[PDB]
Design a protein around this nucleic acid. Structure first.
Ligand SMILES: [K+]
Ligand SMILES: [K+]
Ligand SMILES: [Mg+2]
Ligand SMILES: [Mg+2]
Ligand SMILES: [Mg+2]
Ligand SMILES: [Mg+2]
Ligand SMILES: [Mg+2]
Ligand SMILES: [Mg+2]
Ligand SMILES: [Mg+2]
Ligand SMILES: [Mg+2]
Ligand SMILES: [Mg+2]
Ligand SMILES: [Mg+2]
Ligand SMILES: [Mg+2]
Ligand SMILES: [Mg+2]
Ligand SMILES: [Mg+2]
Ligand SMILES: [Mg+2]
Ligand SMILES: [Mg+2]
Ligand SMILES: [Mg+2]
Ligand SMILES: [Mg+2]
Ligand SMILES: [Mg+2]
Ligand SMILES: [Mg+2]
Ligand SMILES: [Mg+2]
Ligand code: NA
Ligand code: NA
Ligand code: NA
Ligand code: NA
Ligand code: NA
Ligand code: NA
Ligand code: NA
Lengths: 122, 60, 153, 196, 124
RNA sequence: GACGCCCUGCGGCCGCUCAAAAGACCUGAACCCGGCCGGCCGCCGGCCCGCCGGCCCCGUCUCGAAACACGGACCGAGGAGC
RNA sequence: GGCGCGUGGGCCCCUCCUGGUAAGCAGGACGGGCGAGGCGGGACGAUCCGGACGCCGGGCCAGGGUGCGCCGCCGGGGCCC
RNA sequence: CCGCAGAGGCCCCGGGGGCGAAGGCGGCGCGCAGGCCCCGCCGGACCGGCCUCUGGUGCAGAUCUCGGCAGCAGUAGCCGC
C-alpha cells in the first residue's frame, strides 16, 4: 500500500459494469468522477491512472480511463484484473501526480495477446 | 453472415477426378497423364485423363 | 470394524454387533452420553431408567412428545428408552474395564470421547392385510461402538 | 460523512428519485421534517388516492400484507423503497443506509443541512396549481402525533433562536481574527490567482 | 524448440445437458435432439454447444504445456528407433512397464539425450 | 483362530495361524446411511469466492407444451432393422 | 440421365373476397413468415418492429428508447383535468 | 471417424507382466467431440498398440424386465369375545 502512500488524488466511484437490460460486460467498469458533469470535461481526464483498494488484501489494483460514457460525465475504465461485484459502490482514486507502475495497469487480454504471432523461447 | 447467395446461383455439380479403381496400373497411368497435361495444356491429354477416370459402364 | 482411529493410544474400546434394539433410540442414547465423565454417565443412565432424567432427541423426533424434563437442553423433545439404556450401560462398562486394566488408568479421569451407531440387517416376518394381501414386518437393529479416553482437549 | 436534507417544501417523488440515486452510490442520507413534504393536487384527490391505496389486502389473511403505514416518515420511506431493488443484497444494504424523521430530533439537531432546489415546489409548480403537505394527509388517514410534533418543533425553534446571537458575536470575532492573521493572507492571495 | 504461444479457445469441458440433476445421466457429451429441447434452440441462458470453430490452431495442436510432442513407448528398442527428431518429441513410458525395465529405459534415454515425461514414477 | 486379562453369563480386549485375514469367506461399484472434519443453497459467465448478470421439466403426439395433456421415486444390470 | 427417401392434419401477417348479427367462426386469392430462424426491442407472447447464427478482440450503429427500478438528454415553439 | 467382443498377422536376439495384469477410487494432461493417456491408493494373474477379417456391437425414458433400496416414520396401527 506504500506504493501510493501520500499521493493526492481526485475522488471517484465505481457504479457498476457496462451492460444493457439483457447482457453484462464485466471487462469494462463505469466510473463517476467528482466535479465532472459534461462529456467534454471528461475529455479533459482521458487516459489517466486510477486505483481501487480491495477491502480484504488491502493492496491497490490499478487501471486506466478509456473513453466517455453518455452525456453527463461518466467514463469507462479497464483494470489489471476484472472487479468482483462486492466492490460496487466503493471509492477509486484519480491521482494528480504521475506514477510509473510499469505494467501493473494493463488488462489481461492485452498482456497475454498483444501480438498473436509472438514466440516463446527457452 | 447476412448475405443473399440463392438468387441467381445454382447448386454445385459433382464430377469424378480420380479413377476409383484398386488396380495400381490405372492409378499410375492417370497420375502420369495428369502431370503431362499440367506441363503442356494439350487437349488430347486432357480428354485422355478424363477418359481414364471413367467407370466401367461408361467404357464400352 | 472400528470407525475411530488416532494416536492417543490410551483409549479403552468396546463394541457389539447385531444388537436387537431399535437403531434410532440407541443412536439418541449414545449421542446423549457423549462428552460426559464415566461416573456422571452411569448416574445419568440410571436416572433415565426410572424417569428422573430424559434423553433428548435431536435426529429422529417426528412423533416424540414435549416434556418438561427436557427444558434447558436445546430441544423440547425426549423420551425414556429402556432397552437402549441397558445395552449402552453394558457396552460402557466393558469399555471402562478394558481401559482401566490395559493402561492401569483410574476411573476419575476417563471420558466418553467417541461413539458410532450403524444400521444392520434385521429379521423378516410378515403381516396380513385386507383383500388377501401380505406385507412385511421387519426389525431395525444396529451396531454400536464406544470409546473412552483421557479428555476431549 | 452523512448528507442531511431538510424536506420542507420539496416534492415527494423528485426528492425520492434523488435520494435513491444517492443511496445506491454508497452515501448515508438522513431526511428530517418529513411532515412538510408536498404532494401536488387538490386535497380531495390526494386523500381519495390514498384511501384507495389502503383498500388492497390479502383476502384470506390481512396479516400477510400489504401493509399500509400512516406516519409521514414511513410513507416517505415506502415511496423511496419503490425506487430501489430491495430484494437483493445490493439494494437491501442501500435501504439500511437511510434514516427518516418527523421533525428534527436530538440525534440530528447538530448537523449541517442542505436542500435540492431542483425538487422544490416553488420552482416546480405553476402558481395556480393545488398542493398539500403530507402531514395533513397523514393526519386524515390515521396519524396520531401531529399536535405533539408541532409542540416539540415550536419549543426547539425558540431554543434555536436563543442560540443565534451567540453565534453572531463569535462569528464576528472569528472573522476579525482571520482578517488579522498573516498566514491565511498568503493562502488567499495564492488562491485568488485561480479565481477562488 | 521455440514456438508460437498456445491458445485454448475454451478452458472448460462441454458437459451434457441436464447431467447435474440425475446420477443416471453421465456428463459425457451428447447432441440434444428433442422436439421441444431448449438447448437445441440455444436460448440465451443455456450452456454452450460443441462445434467446429473451437478448433485449435494446427501449428500447436497436441502440444504439451512444456512445448514437446508426446510419444508412448514400452521397450528399449522402441526408444532407440524413431527418436532421431528428438528436438520436438518426448518419450512417455507406458503404465504397465515394471521397475527393472524402467531403470534400463531411463539409463538408455539419458545416454541418448531424450526427455522422459514420467521419470519419477515407481521410484520409492 | 494359541496364550493372557475382564465378565453373574451373554460377550469384549490383547494378541495368535498366514505372504495376506482372504475369518465363511476372491475382487467389492452405484443408490441410501453413521461418526469426525470443513461449508451454506442448482447450472452458465466474470472476478482477489460471494457479489452482479442470465436460465420454466425433460421425452412425446401436435398449427401450437412450462402447462390444470400423457410417461417418469431412486440406483445397477439386461433391452429393439439381424 | 439414373436410383431413392420424407411429406400428402398446417397455421399466421398484409391487401382482396364469400356465408353469417357476429365470432380468437367457417371457406377462397398474389406476396411474405412460423413450422424448421438463434440475437435486440414491443413489460409479459411460435408469427409484430429490426436483423437471419463458426470461436474471439476492437470500432460503427438498425429498431426502440434516455426521472428512479434500469444501460442512455439536452435546447427551442405551441397546447394542457 | 471414436468405442466394444472375437479371428488371422506384426511387435530386430523376439511385445508388456508377483520389481505386480484386469478391475475399483481420486487427480493432472491431450482432443471441437465421441474418447484417450499418465500419476497415487486398493487389488492379486493376466493384458494389447498397428494392418486385414467378423458381429447377438454403444440407452434416460417403453403404466419396460429382474434385483436392491429411500422419504413418508419411530408414523398408521396392536377397540369383538
Ligand atoms: K394432442
Ligand atoms: K387426462
Ligand atoms: Mg390384517
Ligand atoms: Mg383370503
Ligand atoms: Mg479442451
Ligand atoms: Mg460460478
Ligand atoms: Mg441471478
Ligand atoms: Mg409417440
Ligand atoms: Mg395420432
Ligand atoms: Mg389439439
Ligand atoms: Mg414439451
Ligand atoms: Mg446395458
Ligand atoms: Mg396424416
Ligand atoms: Mg381458426
Ligand atoms: Mg411437424
Ligand atoms: Mg424461415
Ligand atoms: Mg442509468
Ligand atoms: Mg495366485
Ligand atoms: Mg457374440
Ligand atoms: Mg437405465
Ligand atoms: Mg406426521
Ligand atoms: Mg400409535
Ligand atoms: Na484367485
Ligand atoms: Na414456450
Ligand atoms: Na395418450
Ligand atoms: Na406417475
Ligand atoms: Na425475441
Ligand atoms: Na487400472
Ligand atoms: Na441386441
Amino acid at each position: 500500500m506504500e506504493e501510493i502512500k501520500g499521493k493526492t488524488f481526485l475522488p471517484a466511484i465505481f457504479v457498476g459494469y457496462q451492460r444493457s437490460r439483457a447482457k453484462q460486460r464485466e471487462n469494462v467498469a463505469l466510473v463517476k468522477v467528482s466535479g465532472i458533469y459534461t462529456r467534454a470535461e471528461t475529455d479533459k481526464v482521458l487516459g489517466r491512472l486510477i486505483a481501487i483498494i480491495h477491502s480484504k488484501s488491502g493492496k491497490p489494483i490499478f487501471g486506466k480511463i478509456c473513453r466517455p460514457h453518455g452525456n453527463s460525465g461518466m467514463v469507462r475504465a479497464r483494470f489489471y484484473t476484472n472487479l468482483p461485484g462486492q466492490l460496487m459502490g466503493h471509492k477509486v482514486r484519480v491521482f494528480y501526480d504521475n506514477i510509473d507502475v510499469g505494467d501493473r495497469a494493463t488488462p489481461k487480454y492485452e498482456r497475454l495477446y498483444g501480438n498473436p504471432n509472438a514466440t516463446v523461447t527457452y | 453472415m447476412g448475405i443473399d447467395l440463392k438468387t441467381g446461383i445454382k447448386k454445385r455439380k459433382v464430377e469424378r477426378k480420380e479413377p476409383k479403381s484398386p488396380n495400381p496400373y490405372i492409378r499410375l497411368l492417370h497420375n502420369a497423364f495428369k502431370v503431362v497435361y499440367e506441363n503442356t495444356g494439350e487437349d488430347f491429354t486432357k480428354v485422355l485423363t478424363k477418359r481414364l477416370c471413367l467407370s466401367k459402364t461408361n467404357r464400352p | 470394524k472400528y470407525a475411530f482411529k488416532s494416536d492417543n493410544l490410551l483409549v479403552g474400546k468396546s463394541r457389539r454387533d447385531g444388537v436387537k434394539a431399535s437403531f434410532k433410540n440407541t443412536y439418541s442414547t449414545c449421542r446423549a452420553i457423549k462428552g460426559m465423565g464415566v461416573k456422571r454417565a452411569f448416574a445419568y443412565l440410571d436416572n433415565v431408567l426410572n424417569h428422573k432424567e430424559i434423553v433428548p432427541f435431536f435426529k429422529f423426533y417426528k412423533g416424540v412428545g414435549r416434556h418438561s424434563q427436557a427444558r434447558g437442553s436445546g430441544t423440547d423433545k425426549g423420551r425414556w428408552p429402556e432397552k437402549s439404556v441397558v445395552v449402552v450401560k453394558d457396552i460402557l462398562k466393558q469399555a471402562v474395564s478394558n481401559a482401566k486394566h490395559a493402561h492401569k488408568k483410574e476411573e476419575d479421569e476417563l471420558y466418553v470421547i467417541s461413539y458410532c451407531v450403524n444400521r444392520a440387517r434385521g429379521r423378516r416376518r410378515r403381516t396380513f392385510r385386507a383383500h388377501g394381501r401380505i406385507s412385511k414386518y421387519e426389525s431395525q437393529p444396529c451396531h454400536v461402538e464406544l470409546i473412552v479416553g483421557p479428555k476431549p482437549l | 460523512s452523512r448528507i442531511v436534507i431538510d424536506c420542507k417544501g420539496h416534492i415527494l417523488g423528485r426528492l425520492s428519485a434523488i435520494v435513491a440515486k444517492e443511496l445506491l452510490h454508497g452515501h448515508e442520507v438522513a431526511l428530517v421534517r418529513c411532515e412538510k413534504a408536498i404532494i401536488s393536487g387538490a386535497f380531495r384527490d390526494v386523500k381519495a388516492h390514498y384511501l384507495k391505496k389502503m383498500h388492497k389486502r390479502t383476502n384470506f389473511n390481512h396479516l400477510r400484507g400489504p401493509f399500509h403505514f400512516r406516519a409521514p416518515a414511513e410513507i416517505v420511506r415506502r415511496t423511496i423503497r419503490g425506487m430501489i431493488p430491495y430484494k437483493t443484497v445490493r439494494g437491501s444494504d442501500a435501504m439500511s443506509r437511510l434514516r427518516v424523521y418527523d421533525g428534527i430530533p436530538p440525534c440530528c439537531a447538530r448537523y449541517k443541512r442542505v436542500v435540492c432546489p431542483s425538487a422544490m415546489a416553488y420552482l416546480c409548480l405553476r402558481p395556480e396549481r393545488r398542493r398539500c403537505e403530507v402531514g395533513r394527509v397523514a393526519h386524515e388517514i390515521g396519524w396520531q402525533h401531529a399536535a405533539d410534533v408541532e409542540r416539540y418543533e415550536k419549543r426547539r425553534l425558540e431554543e434555536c433562536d436563543k442560540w443565534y446571537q451567540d453565534k453572531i458575536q463569535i462569528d464576528k470575532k472569528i472573522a476579525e481574527a482571520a482578517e488579522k492573521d498573516a498566514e491565511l493572507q498568503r493562502i488567499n492571495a495564492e488562491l485568488a490567482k485561480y479565481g477562488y | 524448440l521455440p514456438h508460437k504461444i498456445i491458445i485454448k479457445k475454451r478452458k472448460n469441458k462441454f458437459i451434457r445437458f441436464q447431467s447435474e440433476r440425475f446420477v443416471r445421466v453421465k456428463p459425457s457429451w451428447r447432441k440434444p435432439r428433442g422436439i421441444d429441447s431448449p438447448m437445441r434452440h440455444q436460448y440465451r441462458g443455456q450452456r454452450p454447444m460443441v462445434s467446429i470453430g473451437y478448433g485449435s490452431d494446427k501449428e500447436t495442436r497436441f502440444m504439451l504445456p512444456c512445448g514437446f510432442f508426446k510419444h508412448r513407448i514400452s521397450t528399449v528398442h522402441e526408444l532407440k528407433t524413431l527418436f532421431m527428431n528428438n528436438k520436438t518429441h518426448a518419450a512417455q513410458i507406458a503404465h504397465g512397464v515394471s521397475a527393472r525395465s524402467r531403470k534400463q529405459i531411463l539409463e538408455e534415454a539419458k545416454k541418448m539425450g531424450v526427455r522422459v515425461l514420467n521419470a519419477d514414477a515407481k521410484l520409492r
